[PDB]
Symmetry: C3
Subunit: 93 residues, 3 copies
């Protein structure tokens, strides 16, 4: 069993911000990401996306700080982080 | 870095329940929510014409106290009549003070 | 309040793997699951995210099997989170 502790960062925002956000997390160290369509107050196309990425503790805070600084003031964004244990997670570090 | 500890409550149920579940969490104190598609065990996919057979997942960021109020309400009012999944997880949230 | 601690195992993989993965988690002890569409870089010809609430022992059994049988041959992501579940006794 190769299981290691990492962080799962989740971001919810308009789907139109996808390219920018995907670029931001890769730029900050993320080695992958998963997207799920999503919606909120007020159909799965043209709404929001839930972007998730598995990263190390340090990269997680880099991403969150970048979102708080550059995206939160100008867009409706939700961002949070959870603790996870990942199979062969060494690769995401 | 404005990060605070909160709870993420997740509810999975039939799609027709969306309106009532949203009203219910807002009534109990949640300030926002996110809906995503869910299926499995026979349920219909995201592109199906059959909307009734589709499920939805509702996620909401709330305080510890509001989380259990929501979970209790689900256990009392919804679980007895619908196939529902509901759980809670610990999260640290950017600018989370607005969800309390 | 009927709330108990369990584990939430998440697996992201090619959608054609759905059938095999569902059978694998059921075989190893999972008493239910949910599937949600998922897409990654380069976006059916798509992925799925399988989630299952299980006991801590069943979670490790599932993850072990994924590492052995699937990770070497397919592009898969698998992880576990701690969760407290309403009427969770039914998943153990
Ligand atoms: Cl954490
Ligand atoms: Cl918790
Ligand atoms: Cl855990």
């Amino acid at each position: 069993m190769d299981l290691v502790p990492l962080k799962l960062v989740t971001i919810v925002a308009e789907s139109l911000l996808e390219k920018r956000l995907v670029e931001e997390v890769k730029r900050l160290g993320a080695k992958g990401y998963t997207i799920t369509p999503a919606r909120g107050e007020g159909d799965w196309e043209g709404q929001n996306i839930r972007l998730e990425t598995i990263v190390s503790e340090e990269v997680a805070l880099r991403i969150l700080q970048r979102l708080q600084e550059e995206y939160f003031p100008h867009y409706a964004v939700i961002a949070y982080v959870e603790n996870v244990w990942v199979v062969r997670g060494e690769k995401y570090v």
